[PDB]
Amino acid sequence: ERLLDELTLEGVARYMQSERCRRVICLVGAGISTSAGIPDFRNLEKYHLPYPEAIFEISYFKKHPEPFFALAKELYPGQFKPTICHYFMRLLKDKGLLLRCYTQNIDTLERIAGLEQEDLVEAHGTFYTSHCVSASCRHEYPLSWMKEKIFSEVTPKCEDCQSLVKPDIVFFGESLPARFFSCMQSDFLKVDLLLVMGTSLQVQPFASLISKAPLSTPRLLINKEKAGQSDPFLGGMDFDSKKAYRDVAWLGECDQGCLALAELLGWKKELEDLVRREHASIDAQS
């Protein structure tokens, strides 16, 4: 009947290494990056905002961009070092198992860890690239350029047309990337396993993704807290009813959950070597 022989991390690992599991979708949130110690970008009383969310609203940003860039200077991380979880997804990619990583995070660490544009759906956008806001220009700028402008407390302007340059975060008043919908429509016909890591599945439409899986597809949650179950008040996760058949919860730090799964898979040495090498490379940036 069920694809998992037991509703445990061991059952998920056995399934992963079976021929039945070829395509894994990761859905990830802030919990996969808390170990990276990046200031959580998403005090303002001094900017006299007409409403708090104005600092992340596109029309306000075009009127008064300075509050946003002052906050971006304040919360700029000391380093962009991905976690064990990010490199676990890079390993999935290397093993030929990663169909897609859908991320709610804007902190760029998926890209730093080696997931390429085709591997990623950055559902809330990213700080990694920025664009001129003029529709007829849209000149793209990389992270180093913006950092130079931001720490100079110079408002970034396009070299071609002098319009504002905005990081590719999805602001209020903007729609989700069209890539989110096109990839969703195709990927969930193809998925054999959902790995849900470091998200509490509370923000829409990202949460609704778990209900797009085929009914047989196992879903592993690696998270500090159980999440994604149907809300007694309001296709949810069923970990614990006697009808549970495919959903597994591993509760702890996301790094430790990924370590435990890698150990079951025989990947712990590969993962350790990857993380140590990449961290050393980032630490050695001269």
Ligand SMILES: NC(=S)c1ccc(OCC(F)(F)F)nc1
């Ligand atoms: N705390 C986070 S996530 C953070 C803050 C600032 C920042 O600035 C990047 C750029 F310079 F491109 F704007 N990037 C990330």
Ligand SMILES: [Cl-]
């Ligand atoms: Cl969430």
Ligand SMILES: [Zn+2]
């Ligand atoms: Zn421009």
